[model samples]
Target: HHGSDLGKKLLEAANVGQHDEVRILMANGADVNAADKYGDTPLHLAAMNGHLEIVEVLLKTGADVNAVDFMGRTPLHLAADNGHLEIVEVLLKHGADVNAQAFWGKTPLHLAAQQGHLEIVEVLLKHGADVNAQDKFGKTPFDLAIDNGNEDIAEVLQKAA
Candidate 1:
């Protein structure tokens, strides 16, 4: 619908971290969850880009925190993969599913551990992530942690049950 120009702009505004523009668009009736052909929502773009304020704004505007992309990755997954602690924190606090699996069957914890993001791994665990969860290759977070030579991440991961 040509009437969805608001949504088109919302995605761009969200991607560029234009908090005021985003708010204006949403306040004027933009679909906070509107996604492009790749299945990436405005929240996904904001989170992926590490825009914390925009993430907060979009979440407050009814954005889907766990909306998946074409790759089956949620905003939290992307944020963690990109090593964005702030985005990760905002997403987790906003009801992101820490245990949610992506297309590769890797959970947020899996990405955090594999990516050697120790703090993210800790946060995921604190938020009830299953460290023992496996991915498509049947590898656990700890397994990937070690595979990546993340000794510290390995140690922290084992600190869990």
Candidate 2:
């Protein structure tokens, strides 16, 4: 984790979606893959905040698309859980793991369902999310969909079953 001052600014810029500052900082020698204490790179910050432009800029700079945070959360997980459909697809296009499981064995689909992200759910399924994947509690994404108050997703995922 060779963190630089420019790297810090780039990460902050990524979080704020400041395309100019992100590009400027990286040009000034920021590490594209620099991680914070939590192992979060610019990719994680941008993806978590649904900043599609910043995510794209960082990815173009060669940021590690699949870098995991301390909690084992990837950019894909944050994007899916937060309902950023476009960001999810962008990451997927760059080869983000559709079925990447975190420390709790929760996949992106699990977070998408837990938060009632119906459209995100559709995108994840289209990108090949594992509906049958089990979590630490051994519950599936469909189970979380029901527990979290979305009745229609059951109808949606039922077709997959």
Candidate 3:
């Protein structure tokens, strides 16, 4: 049920990984930085959906690389949490805050480790994510790795520790 013009066409296109539509919308004066109710911008949705081209275009179009969602999650957080390695790299290269904390103080590394995303964890570590940084519950990436039964990630976090 796409509304006549609800200001979400760009968001919807980004959510569905439609790179061309995103570009067209941006070119047509759509708010490249517009956010949904959850504060998730087009960049956030693109990164979350593993849309590398869309992410790249959004960044090139001047989307804030460090924009945070309602939960305080930047595109880096969403990319890492979903194991989008290339998206994570692109975001990092654009200066997305690698160590940004979400509502629970969980960094991208914490979310990656928790989700068993070994490659994403490694990427975050390479980007200088604070492996030992604690969340609101005193849980570190290492702690989440261990709790989530991801020994590979736990070992990596341990090395970073």
Best candidate according to lDDT: 2
What is candidate 2's lDDT per residue for 106-160, written digit by digit as tens? 9999999889998888988998988899999999989999998787886687777
Backbone collision tally, model 3: 0
Q: State how far residue 31 of model 1 sits from its true place (Å).
A: 0.2
Candidate 2 residue spans exceeding 4 A from truth: 1-3
Global local distance difference test of model 2: 0.90
A best-first ranking of the candidates according to their lDDT comes to 2, 1, 3
lDDT (10s digit) by residue, model 1, range 1-161: 64389999999998989999999988888999998889999988888898889999888878888898999999999898878898898888889999999998989898888888888888889899997898999999999989999999999888896
Model 1 accuracy (lDDT, Cα):
0.89
On residues 24-111, what C-alpha lDDT tens digit does candidate 3 reach at each position? 8877778878889999999999999899999999999899999999989999999998989999999999998989998989899999
lDDT of all predictions = 0.89, 0.90, 0.89
Structure candidate 2, residue pairs in collision: none
- Regions more than 4 Å wrong, model 3: 1-7
Question: Candidate 1: lDDT of 34?
Answer: 90
TM-score of each: 0.95, 0.95, 0.94
Which 10-residue window in model 2 sums to the lowest lDDT?
1-10
